[PDB]
């Protein structure tokens, strides 16, 4: 039950700006400034039968109205979720709540999402109030202070115990709440927010999200209290968005400070589409619009781009000597042996010239220095990646490409991703405007562009899921039930609100169903079922025809083929150009489908003209987003695309004359002309190659399949409906109903799955795995094997527990165990490592054997699991790196041993440190003294030199 849904407009004036246009962007007011406007939205989720008085009349006991409303709620003692951009001023709301609790002699808690941000907030809060303390997973300081900044992860472990500190706690402030949707660590936020006391109030600070009300309602239902939302797209530093068509000299304003899309400038920008980074930085330098961040999505793209900046220097020798002193002082924190590291020496010349690199591969010391030198204005252009929460604002931000790389494809940047990165432009006070520039290399459609630069932010969708360590922890605690979590998870709340919108689609879907009725239903249905059976068997022969054994012999150059990639995009009839085996340079010996085992280059004449074909890779058949068959009434351009065999609908009996160099100039045009002729001489269609007479497929099972088809056709030819004039008419009326009926049956089950509690079956399945492995008794009373799994959190709690109790680490050496545990701390992918020596392959196979024993139990317990996928999820590629690091090898030796970036090695070593420290504490509970001495020797062996070095 909701109410009080008023919007209110707030206007202000800012200095005028022509930006990069040779003309003013917005009509200036009489005062010589430009008037802007933003909207502040408010709603409240009320619990049933609650005495509520509408806001905009609260009295308090340099502010924006979105702060005034949110503060008014805090003054009234009701929870509030604030949604606004990164610089909009949300911290003003947290400070009021942190103050209102002090003036009442009450305690307030503050949770920070990522690492050090709490520690910096700890120091920042002391200066503002004094009566503040810090509690964290790493260190613990001052609990007795009135206010306490605390890690979010530490709070979840603290609420299971029920430390009763909440006795005199009035407000819990969650900063950057939208991290609750993180697929890896988002479950924690939901867990802690579920376990909050109903008597405590909350202040939720989140970025711009559309579904802010779904979160407030969820708060309202769980904790039986009203919950407000305050939303505003308000951008404090106004932004200007430009498009830079590649290889051109143009710059076009596509959307301005009022978020209005400039149509004419766009079509001009697209007209120009027919080095580049160098031009844009030199422009921004001469126009004094620095600092700049040029975002690349790959770590190598950043370093390569900065290398292309070899010519320019942005710093005077006084500044070059200045930053070099800061650089050298920070390097001093490293051991003298690591101060001559190649990554360190090679980056200094770039820094002296005023150009910086910032990516996850950097050493922890270097990343920190580069961040500071950029703050000091010593670095004028920063080559960075999307992954950053840091305070690194620049006044102009540039994107290398208009597309982001997906796991296997190049996808268009999403509306949200543009919002999250354009926000890195503009600085409060310093800059009158923020500039974002996007280099585009494709004749993108208008509606696609509006969806990007003017799109909407991502929704805050729950990522709650059951965990084995979570379930075991709930068994030790007597007060909270796993069923209770599911019933209160934001996930469950999102399903119970989904079924009324699904029921509307269902009742609408059946309205079309009742209105359809086909005469002679029995005869029409039989004809439909037979044709469907024929459709199925004929698709089955296609797989036999397209299989490499039979197809490859007939895939000569010029062969005519019908292309239907992924059963969706139909390119019509084309000509085979060449074919070769698929090898997968990355992650070799990867399994391929028999039909996907080969890649065929085919010429097509139905490609949409403005499709960006320049993105095509020679052996990557995943067609990038935007490469599509020409729609009706659209121009066609000849091109060559790669396809797997599954993308062939039928193989032709004809074959063209192909030039030696199809890549030559105007050759695709001449072949496209011949394709037009073959398509013209055969308007009804191209004859296919006969599988038995022509292709000589003689397999006996194949012959039985063909006979199964012939039977249904003569069966079809003897149906009463075959000789009817209304056949096409009476069949479409039925086939439209059958599709509807299958759609309705799908939705009928979909609502059933959401009618019950979510993953309630999954909870019973996980518990079955625990009882089977011996982690709890057949009556789910916790066992010792289960108790030790509660202590493990930096890795697979089940497998690490089974390895410890099975004595796998007993027969090993400390250098061997460290390499084994490396498979539990390295999650990112890398190049396949060389074959392991027998000293490291034996404990690996000894763990892979236990892993399969677990995977089979998960599959047998009815959990959706691929056995092969699970065993390979424990990356062993760094085993030799960790092993030699323990044997005394230097950091310079192990870096030349893998393609993993230096910073990533540091992160996993430290992540391995955290895991080994957990197994040390576990040896105390299990009472295994031999294991304690083992893991401690492992920790001292890893913790040396660079990994042991500290931060600034």
């Amino acid at each position: 039950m909701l109410a009080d849904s008023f919007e209110q407009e707030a206007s202000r004036e800012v200095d005028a700006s022509k930006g990069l246009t040779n003309s003013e962007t917005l009509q200036v007011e009489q005062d010589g400034k430009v008037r802007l406007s933003h909207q502040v939205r408010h709603q409240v989720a009320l619990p049933p039968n609650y005495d509520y008085t509408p806001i905009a009349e609260h009295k308090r006991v340099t502010l924006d109205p979105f702060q005034d409303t949110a503060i008014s709620c805090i003054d009234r003692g009701e929870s509030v979720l604030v949604s606004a951009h990164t610089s909009a001023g949300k911290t003003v709301v947290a400070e009021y709540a942190i103050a209102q609790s002090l003036k009442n002699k009450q305690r307030v808690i503050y949770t920070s999402p990522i690492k050090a941000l709490s520690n910096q907030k700890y120091r920042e809060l002391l200066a503002e109030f004094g009566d503040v303390g810090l509690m964290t997973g790493d260190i613990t300081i001052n609990p007795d202070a009135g206010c306490l900044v605390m890690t979010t992860e530490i709070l979840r472990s603290m609420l299971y115990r029920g430390s009763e500190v909440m006795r005199e706690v009035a407000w819990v402030i969650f900063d950057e709440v939208h991290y609750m949707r993180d697929k890896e660590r988002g479950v924690v936020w939901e867990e802690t927010i579920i376990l909050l006391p109903d008597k405590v109030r909350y202040v939720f600070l989140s970025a711009t999200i559309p579904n802010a009300m779904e979160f407030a309602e969820w708060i309202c239902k769980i904790h039986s209290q009203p919950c407000h939302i305050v939303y505003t797209n308000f951008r404090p530093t106004p932004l200007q968005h430009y498009l830079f068509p590649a290889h051109g000299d143009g710059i076009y304003l596509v959307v301005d400070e009022k978020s209005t899309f400039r149509e004419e400038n766009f079509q001009k920008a697209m007209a120009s589409i027919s080095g580049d980074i160098y031009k844009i930085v030199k422009m921004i330098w001469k126009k004094k619009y620095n600092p700049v961040i040029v975002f690349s999505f790959s770590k190598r793209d950043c370093e390569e781009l900065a290398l292309k900046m070899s010519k320019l220097d942005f710093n005077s020798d006084d500044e070059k000597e200045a930053l070099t002193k800061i650089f050298n002082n920070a390097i001093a924190l490293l051991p003298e042996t690591d101060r001559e590291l190649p990554q360190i020496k090679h980056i200094l010349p770039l820094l002296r010239r005023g150009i910086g690199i910032h990516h996850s591969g950097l050493l922890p010391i270097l990343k920190e220095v580069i961040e500071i030198l950029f703050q000091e204005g010593f670095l004028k252009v920063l080559f960075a990646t999307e992954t950053f929460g840091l305070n690194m604002p620049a006044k102009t931000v540039v994107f290398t490409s208009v597309r982001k790389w997906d796991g296997q494809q190049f996808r268009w940047v999403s509306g949200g991703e543009y919002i999250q990165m354009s926000g890195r432009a503009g600085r409060r006070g310093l800059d009158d405007r923020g500039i974002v520039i996007m280099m585009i290399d494709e004749k993108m459609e208008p509606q696609v562009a509006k969806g990007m630069v003017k799109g909407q932010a991502d929704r805050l969708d729950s990522a709650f899921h059951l965990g084995y360590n979570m379930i075991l922890n709930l068994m030790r605690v007597e007060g909270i039930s796993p069923e209770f979590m599911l019933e209160h998870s934001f996930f469950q709340f999102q399903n119970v609100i989904s079924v009324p919108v699904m029921e509307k689609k269902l009742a609408e879907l059946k309205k079309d169903f009742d209105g359809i009725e086909v005469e002679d239903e029995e005869n029409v249905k039989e004809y439909h079922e037979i044709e469907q059976a024929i459709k199925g068997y004929r698709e089955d022969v296609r797989q036999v025809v397209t299989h490499p054994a039979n197809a490859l012999s007939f895939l000569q150059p010029g062969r005519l083929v019908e292309i239907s990639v992924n059963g969706k995009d139909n390119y019509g009839w084309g000509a085979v150009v060449d074919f070769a085996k698929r090898i997968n340079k990355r992650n070799p010996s990867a399994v391929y489908t028999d039909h996907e085992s080969y890649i065929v280059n085919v010429v097509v004449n139905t490609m949409y003209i403005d499709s960006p074909v320049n993105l095509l890779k020679p052996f990557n058949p995943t067609l990038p987003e935007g490469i599509r068959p020409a729609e009706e009434g659209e121009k066609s351009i000849c091109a060559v695309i790669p396809i797997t065999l599954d993308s062939i609908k039928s193989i032709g009996n004809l074959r063209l004359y192909m030039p030696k160099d199809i890549r030559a100039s105007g050759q695709k045009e001449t072949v496209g002309k011949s394709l037009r002729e073959v398509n013209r001489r055969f308007p009804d269609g191209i004859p296919v190659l006969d599988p038995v007479k022509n292709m000589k497929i003689e397999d006996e099972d194949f012959l039985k399949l063909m006979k199964k088809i012939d039977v249904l056709n003569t069966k079809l030819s003897s149906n009463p409906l075959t000789n009817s004039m209304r056949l096409e008419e009476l069949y479409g009326k039925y086939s439209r109903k059958h599709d509807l009926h299958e759609d309705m049956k799908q939705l009928k089950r979909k609502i059933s799955e959401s009618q019950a509690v979510i993953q309630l079956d999954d909870l019973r399945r996980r518990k079955r795995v625990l009882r089977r492995l011996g982690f709890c008794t057949p009556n789910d009373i916790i066992e010792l094997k289960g108790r030790v799994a509660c202590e493990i959190s930096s890795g697979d709690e089940l497998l690490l527990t089974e390895l410890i109790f099975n004595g796998n680490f007993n027969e090993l050496k400390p250098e061997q165990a460290a390499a084994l545990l490396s498979c539990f701390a390295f999650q990112e992918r890398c190049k396949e490592a060389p074959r392991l020596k027998p000293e490291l392959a034996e404990p690996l196979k000894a763990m892979r054997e236990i892993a399969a024993k677990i995977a089979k139990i998960m599959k047998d317990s009815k959990i959706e699991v691929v056995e092969k996928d699970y065993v390979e999820s424990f990356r062993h590629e760094l085993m030799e790196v960790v092993y030699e690091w323990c044997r005394g090898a230097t950091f310079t030796q192990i870096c030349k041993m893998t393609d993993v970036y230096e910073g990533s090695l540091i992160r996993m070593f430290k992540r391995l440190e955290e895991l080994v420290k957990e197994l040390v504490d576990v040896a105390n509970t299990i009472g295994n003294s031999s294991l304690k001495e083992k893991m401690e020797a492992v920790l001292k062996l890893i913790h040396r030199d660079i990994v042991s070095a500290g931060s600034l």
């Binding site: 012999s553 010029g558 062969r559 063209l656 022509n694 000589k696």
Partner: peptide
């Protein structure tokens, strides 16, 4: 003309 009809499969 611009092509030929081919029904034989190379490499047996």
């Amino acid at each position: 003309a611009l092509f030929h009809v081919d029904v034989e499969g190379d490499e047996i």
